[PDB]
């Protein structure tokens, strides 16, 4: 209960949507829904990595680790990940 309701909503919506192919469209919205900030998946140049780029007008706190926890859990097991955050 003590968590923000919007945070709980974002967690739930991302949780429900994880039941289909991890195409760049579906992965982007799942991460976008969880964070609430706009996300663009880069489809990184490296052979077996995919890039993630986040954008928010309001900025972010200094802690966003749980997003990386979900991404590690949600990503294909054979692909690494990279991040960059933009205001």
Partner 1 sequence: ERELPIPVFLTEDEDSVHERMLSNFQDVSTLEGDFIYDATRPTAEQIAELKQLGLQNNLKIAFPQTSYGTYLEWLGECKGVFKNQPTKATGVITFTGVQGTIITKGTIVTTIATDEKQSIEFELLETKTIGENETVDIKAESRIVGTIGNVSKGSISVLLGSISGVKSITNKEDFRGGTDIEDEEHFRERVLVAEQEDKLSGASSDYIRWAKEVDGVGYAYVVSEWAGAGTVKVLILDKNRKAATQELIDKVQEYIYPLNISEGENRDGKAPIGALVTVVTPDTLLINVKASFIFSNGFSEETVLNNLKTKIDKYLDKIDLGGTVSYNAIQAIVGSMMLTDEGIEDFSNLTINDVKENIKLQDQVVGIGEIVNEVVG
- Verify binding: residue 7, partner 1, rule CB under 8 A: no
Report the C-alpha gap between 40 and 27 in whole angstroms.
Answer: 10
- Verify binding: residue 61, partner 1, rule CB under 8 A: no
Among 37, 50, 54, 67, binds partner 1 (CB under 8 A): 50
Q: Are strands 80-86 and 49-55 parallel, antiparallel or unpaired?
A: parallel
CB 42 within 8 A of CB 29: no
- CB nearer to partner 1: give 62 or 78: 78
Q: Cβ neighbours of residue 35 under 8 Å, at least 6 residues apart?
A: 10, 54, 64, 67
- Verify binding: residue 43, partner 1, rule CB under 8 A: yes
Strand partners, 39: 54
- Interface region with partner 1, contact rule CB under 8 A, candidates 1-9, 56-64, 66-74: 66-74
- Verify binding: residue 10, partner 1, rule CB under 8 A: no
Residues that bind partner 1 (CB under 8 A): 13, 15-30, 40-41, 43-44, 46-50, 72-80
């Amino acid at each position: 209960l003590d968590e923000d309701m919007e945070t709980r909503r974002r967690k739930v919506i991302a949780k429900l949507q994880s039941k289909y192919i991890m195409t760049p469209k579906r992965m982007s919205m799942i991460l976008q829904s969880y964070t609430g900030a706009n996300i663009k998946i880069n489809e990184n140049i490296s052979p077996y990595t995919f890039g993630v780029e986040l954008t928010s007008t309001q900025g972010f706190p200094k802690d966003l680790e749980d997003l990386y926890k979900r991404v590690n859990v949600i990503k294909p097991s054979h692909l690494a990940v990279s991040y960059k955050l933009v205001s």
